Amino acid sequence: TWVDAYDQKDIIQPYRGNPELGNLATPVNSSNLVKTYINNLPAYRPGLTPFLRGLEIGMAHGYFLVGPEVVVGPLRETAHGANLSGLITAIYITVSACLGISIFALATFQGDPRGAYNSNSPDRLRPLRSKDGWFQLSGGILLGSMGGAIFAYVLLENFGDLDAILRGAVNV
Amino acid sequence: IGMAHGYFLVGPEVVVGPLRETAHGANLSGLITAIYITVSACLGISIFALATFQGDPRGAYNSNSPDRLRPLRSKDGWFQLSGGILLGSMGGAIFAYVLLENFGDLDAILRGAVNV
Amino acid sequence: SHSVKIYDTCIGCTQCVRACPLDVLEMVPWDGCKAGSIASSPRTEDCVGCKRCETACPTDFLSIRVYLGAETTRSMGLAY
Amino acid sequence: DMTQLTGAYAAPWLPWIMIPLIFYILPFPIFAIIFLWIERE
Amino acid sequence: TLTGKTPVFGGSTGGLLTRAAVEEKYAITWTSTKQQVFEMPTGGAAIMHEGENLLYLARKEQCLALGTQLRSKFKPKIEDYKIYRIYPNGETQYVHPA
Amino acid sequence: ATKFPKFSQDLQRDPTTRRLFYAIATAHDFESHDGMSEENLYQRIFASHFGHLAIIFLWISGILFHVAWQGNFEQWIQDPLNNSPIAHAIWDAQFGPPAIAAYTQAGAMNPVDICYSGVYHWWYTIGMRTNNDLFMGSIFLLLLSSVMLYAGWLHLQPRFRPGLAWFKNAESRLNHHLAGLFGVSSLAWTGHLVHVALPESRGQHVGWDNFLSIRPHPEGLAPLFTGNWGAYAQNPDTAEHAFGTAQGAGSAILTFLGGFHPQTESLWLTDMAHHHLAIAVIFIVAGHMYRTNFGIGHNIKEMTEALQGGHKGIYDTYNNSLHFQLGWHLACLGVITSLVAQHMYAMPPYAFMARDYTTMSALYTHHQYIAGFLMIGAFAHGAIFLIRDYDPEANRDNVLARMLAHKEAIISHLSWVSLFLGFHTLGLYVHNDCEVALGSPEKQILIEPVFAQWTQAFHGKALYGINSLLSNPDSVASTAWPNYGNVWLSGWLEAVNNGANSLFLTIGPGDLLVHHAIALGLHVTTLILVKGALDARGSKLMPDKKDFGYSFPCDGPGRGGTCDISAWDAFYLATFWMLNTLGWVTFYWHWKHLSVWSGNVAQFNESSTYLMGWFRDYLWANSAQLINGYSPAGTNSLAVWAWMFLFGHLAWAVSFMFLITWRGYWQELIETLMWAHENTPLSFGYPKDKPVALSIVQARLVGLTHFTVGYIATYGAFLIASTSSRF
Amino acid sequence: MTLSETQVFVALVIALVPAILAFRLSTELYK
């Protein structure tokens, strides 16, 4: 009754062909579409310097973090005040997150680290295995998210001239 | 390389671009032009390095290449140059933008009008 | 690379070997014609495909045929 | 109405963002993705 | 492993490029009985030496076009030319005459 | 090597820029791919056909969406003669205020394009009335295309992949496509015409909420069962019926009137419903002819194999060769697309479309250029068949073996008709040119077209006064003596004998000279394609041409020189002749109709007999408002057509670079640029693919592409701007 | 009248379904 179980093909497989590992190979973690997308995100893109990983992660993140306080925040009744409070929110979150990245690296990499950053760890999802990769990612995320936030701030502060550009009103 | 290049790339659209009739609009369109060219060029630097350095590269970045004019021979040198050009040219563009947006006070500084 | 085929109508006049600027062709003994020799193409990976050998062949139709195949750096004639 | 691009149809902000996205924001990422696809070994 | 004087030549823009150092190279070696002028396949005129010569070229067609000129444009003829293929690891293969 | 392209390992090892271009141009040639088994070939074609079907449904779904969102369909159906259809809105942020004001047209409040495709006239006739009708039609095709994308993915799954014997079942497909694809769809279209399109033409709204209540007929469905089918040919429509309103309307749903609805100037919806019902049951009958599973039915290979003294093996030649089928179906589709163009202008089927003059010019030129492209691809794929799939032993002494043995007789007879037509048509045109220039325009040789004038009289024109056999009242072809049941005729003869419609126009001596120039262009384009197909396996210049393939550059400068010797290069040569032929066709259609629509039909008649009259009065005279679309005096709504006019002239000129200059000029120029890049400082880039010049075949194709794009963008801008600015 | 803003947003959400189904047909046809 159970003898022909595990003989027909199944789209759910043991993770890395090992049924003793505590994971499964699903379409969400192991299909060709999600592996092409996730492994080419700047956290995982092969060959990148740790700083350039941080710069792309920062520039994407600081850009959208200006957004929420501009529209729904306490300064939202005036345009110039809402853009400033959205910029300061993205600045404060970035400094706090990059302080957390730095003190993570100062705490984890003391001798041989415990857990996923140990020298024996086969953690494919956590590949930044040295402290100089973490400090360069910290500086990359800081500079990228500061730049992405002030880019969103400059576009939102100049929204009246930027809307006139995108409607051809500058050609009068 | 970035700081030198993003600084002058603001220039052309400020003076001869489509926003040139007003000062604040011309500086913004010159800044956005330097930002867009920088992101496009640094995207090109990154995808050059992702395409070239696959095993032993062909041509001038091969291990046997005596190309003195092309000395950046590893992909981590190219990705650090990409991030350097991005941060420098963004900073040089926003430096030229800040000087041109404050040209009325900067002209008053350079003529001693701030000593009245 | 290209493909250089020599057919058995070859009269062994050695004119394709003289015409080849890449030294693809050589003469081997055959005993299948009066001259006792036939053309061969051992170094066909150096063939650029100029078809100078077919221009030199006096047999009707040609005893040597060049078939343009996969393009390599040598067959495209690139000095760079 | 006569001095700039407007739209008297539903959601007139959609061409305001889609034409920048389709024509000069997304193509260079798409060209870069296609370039990495045809150069990979 | 390859002997010969380089011919007297001021250099040109038609010579060896990046391909010569990273993929393959070619060298033609010949003996001459007198000092005389030949035409380079890369453009221009060079002077071969009396005795053994050695010239590095980019393509096999350039060496065989030089050997055609050596056999046809000089009295007495120069027939003893040898053409080698040099690989970037220094591995030299004797390709003409085979 | 590189991974791209995955279908050609020899292209993967190509180290140059030729790898990327040749991977495009061979991506859909599935048989030449690496390890393509012949059964896997049919399964990927079947799934690619589902992908092309979904692109078609997404295309019409976007046309319906952009009219419902940004068009003026509900404003246009009030008065379709005084309104202008809107294609979509314009969003171009480089526009200045004079360009914004110029394209804020047709009563819109934003910049828009004027629709010239005729989809407003098509949706109005079939019963669309609101923008909510066009939206749910756009949503339905948005889901129908996703069904096509599902079925392409599904029939690639291992359980649902069809085997080879299912693909070769030429009886079960020909029965199902005759009776289901051609019959049931034409039956269901009659069901749309009589339930929906006919009541909306008579003021009654019929939608999905109230179609189960409202009958198509007052005597609902009972005259069909009781055999009194003439109760559907009721009071058909009065001569004072207004389209879309209940006044003057009838109750008939299937009538045999002929001619035109007098207000809309188009075909009756009852003649179009009885058309698609008669077409349906005939196609459903025709789909019950061949044996599949039940013993009854003919067998197609038996009619071919038992046909000699010559059709032995013609079944297996057809059934096993996909290029024979593709070349056969492109020839049948190419004739029909010409027939669509010739019959939609003569008998307009859509309401008020015959008075939209720019749409009628755009639709004729569209479907004629499509038909010319399908015609040269029928011969191209018939030539790929003779190189790849043709077996000389399976087709010994049959008809395909006859023409390959007759090939010097077919080509030489096509060459005489080509040289006779070209010597005498150009000779008559230059003679008339020299007579008009030297002040004697009545010394022109004006041969009257007596054969097609009598053919017009045999169809119903009494304009020539020759009064014989359907130009005759008491003819036996008119009265239909055993029947007296030609109900079409009394409505038909008002379509022929009126001067405002466009079926059987009056032809004169300028119409004969252009029909012989069209016959010259048909015969030369056939001569290039037939000679390219019959010499595709070999000639006396190149006897082993079948082992070199369909497309190759040449066989070298020996044997006299062999430039453009392959069968592909005869396609390349005939594309110039196809465009020149379709140029002569659409020039004649447009200049004749611009003279008829302006009332100046006389001015066509003196000027079309000499070539300066085409040059001065058609090309030069109608360019005047097109090239004034922008000027130092300002810009107007023809500015995009003036800019596209120069764009087309530019692409046609870029074409001449690829067609006159050939490869080794450009290859030696690229070596100097490769020298300059390697020896320039600060230029850190380096080409991964080695830069080479484009290949000999590629730049014939690139040059033909710029020629064709330059041909169509020039005339398409000229056709729109000259017609829409005069009317 | 023409479309409403809720009708345009319905068409944009529905069109994600043939966008996903064309992606899985393209990757199935091959790389």
Ligand code: F6C
């Ligand atoms: C990439 C890399 C590279 C580099 C570096 O790095 C370079 C550089 C050079 C120098 C050295 C010189 C000078 C400059 C100039 O003035 O010119 C203009 C150009 C330009 C401007 C170009 C440039 C480009 C840049 C650099 C880059 C950019 C990129 C982008 C921005 C990105 C984007 C991305 C996305 C995805 C799209 C050159 C040149 C030439 N080119 Mg050459 N490049 C190259 C690229 C390319 C390609 C692809 C092709 C094909 C198209 C070509 C082509 C050509 C020709 C024809 C010629 C000529 O004539 C010239 C000469 O030689 O003199 C003498 N070439 N250049």
Ligand code: CLA
């Ligand atoms: C009755 C059942 C039935 C039906 C309806 C179909 C229908 C179809 N099959 Mg077929 N098929 C069937 C049974 C059926 N099949 C069976 C039993 C087999 C096995 C033996 C096959 C084996 C098969 C294969 C291998 C293939 C098909 C394909 C097709 C499609 C043809 C392409 C097309 O869209 O043209 C539609 C054609 C028409 C609607 C008629 C056009 C007639 C002329 C040209 C125009 C006349 C219309 C009018 C004048 C124009 C007005 C329009 C205008 C107003 C807009 C079509 C959807 C092809 C395909 O594309 O697969 C996805 C394909 O490759 N079939």
Ligand SMILES: CC1=C(/C=C/C(C)=C/C=C/C(C)=C/C=C/C=C(C)/C=C/C=C(C)/C=C/C2=C(C)CCCC2(C)C)C(C)(C)CCC1
């Ligand atoms: C839908 C979708 C998705 C998603 C996506 C997303 C989520 C997006 C995002 C987006 C974003 C999130 C974006 C971002 C952007 C950013 C940017 C692009 C930035 C830039 C920056 C800059 C430009 C800056 C500059 C500077 C500096 C650095 C310094 C100085 C100053 C300045 C400002 C100049 C996916 C794919 C999943 C899937 C499919 C669908």
Ligand SMILES: CC1=C(/C=C/C(C)=C/C=C/C(C)=C/C=C/C=C(C)/C=C/C=C(C)/C=C/C2=C(C)CCCC2(C)C)C(C)(C)CCC1
């Ligand atoms: C005449 C001459 C020449 C030439 C020269 C030139 C060409 C010049 C150039 C110049 C230039 C081209 C300059 C540049 C400059 C730049 C700069 C100096 C920059 C700066 C920057 C900055 C300062 C920035 C900053 C920042 C950042 C980074 C971030 C945040 C924000 C800010 C803004 C703060 C030569 C030598 C050859 C020779 C002799 C004569």
Ligand SMILES: [Ca+2]
């Ligand atoms: Ca507040």
Ligand SMILES: [Ca+2]
């Ligand atoms: Ca301006």
